[PDB]
Amino acid sequence: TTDGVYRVMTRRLLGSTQVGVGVMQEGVFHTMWHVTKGAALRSGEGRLDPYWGDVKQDLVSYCGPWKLDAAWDGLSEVQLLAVPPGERAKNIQTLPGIFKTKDGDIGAVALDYPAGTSGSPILDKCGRVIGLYGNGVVIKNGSYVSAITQGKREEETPV
Amino acid sequence: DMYIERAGDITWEKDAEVTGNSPRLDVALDESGDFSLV
Ligand SMILES: N=C(N)N[C@@H]1CCCCNC(=O)[C@H](CCCCN)NC(=O)[C@H](CCCCN)NC(=O)Cc2cccc(c2)CNC(=O)CNC1=O
């Protein structure tokens, strides 16, 4: 569970398929729910068990609670650290648009990558992860816009 | 067998390629995590 960005792979009898991406931080793995469907993960010879998740947010964390707490500041450019299937990690910079919802605005990036790029981190200029890529909409011309999806880092749970 | 493989460090790239517009879209989020255009 060393810090960094990881591909999420599935293997049956033949080869492997990249189904998504996630972020290891503070010993917790963070990805989008639709990548793993909230099931357990293998890391080397070790098993990562789901710990927290929320299908409406389309998020899940493994080994501990959600750790990523940075937020888009609402006006600065951001970078998608895209990790596409079969391709090296690459940074793409963009100025987010907005998903306007009855409950508030969500930053959103008009960047279109393969489905298995889901869970790639979106970064601020300090390199902090301000959300994960891959829950979005298809607009009229067929292109894609992803929410900047971020979870809540809860305060330490009592004892 | 669903497993993870490290793919790199998380860093901001100086002088990165820029692209994409900044669409403003009315959307709804349902209890299953689906965004839809209104
Ligand atoms: N230019 C496109 N269409 N680009 C995407 C980028 C995915 C980026 C990663 N994210 C996803 O894989 C998610 C998974 C589902 C999450 C649901 N909570 N998906 C989406 O957020 C959208 C949602 C639509 C709104 C739901 N109310 N689903 C799709 O885009 C499905 C779709 C639609 C038309 C055509 C295609 C796919 C064919 N395109 C591909 O095969 C590769 N490209 C993509 O699929």
Author numbering:
A (entry chain B): 18 to 176
B (entry chain A): 50 to 87
Provide the authors' original text about this structure.
Stepwise truncation of the linker segment by replacing GABA with β‐Ala or Gly provided the further improved analogues 9 and 10. The inhibition constants of analogues 8–11 revealed that a 23‐membered macrocycle represents an optimal ring size for targeting all three tested flavivirins and that it comes to a drastic drop in potency after further truncation in case of inhibitor 11. A crystal structure was determined for the best inhibitor 10 in complex with bZiPro. The P1 interactions are similar to those described above for the complex with inhibitor 4, although a stronger contact (3.0 Å) between the P1 guanidine and Gly159 is formed. Interestingly, two conformations of the side chain from NS2B residues Asp83 and Ser85 were found. In one conformation, the side chain of Asp83 is directed to the P2 Lys amino group (occupancy 53 %) as found in most other complexes. In the second conformation it interacts with the P3 Lys amino group (occupancy 47 %). In case of Ser85, approximately 37 % of its side chain is directed to the P3 Lys residue, whereas the major part (63 %) points upwards lacking any contact to the ligand. Although we used identical P2 and P3 residues (Lys) in all inhibitors, we have only found two conformations of the Asp83 side chain in the bZiPro/10 and bZiPro/9 complexes, which were equally directed toward the S2 or S3 pocket. This flexibility might be relevant for the efficient binding and processing of the natural occurring NS4A/2K cleavage site segment within the ZIKV polyprotein.
A series of cyclic active‐site‐directed inhibitors of the NS2B‐NS3 proteases from Zika (ZIKV), West Nile (WNV), and dengue‐4 (DENV4) viruses has been designed. The viral protease consists of the N‐terminal third of the nonstructural protein NS3 containing the catalytic triad composed of residues Ser135, His51, and Asp75. NS3 has to form a complex with its cofactor NS2B to achieve proteolytic activity. Due to their essential function in the processing of the viral polyprotein, they emerged as potential antiviral drug targets.
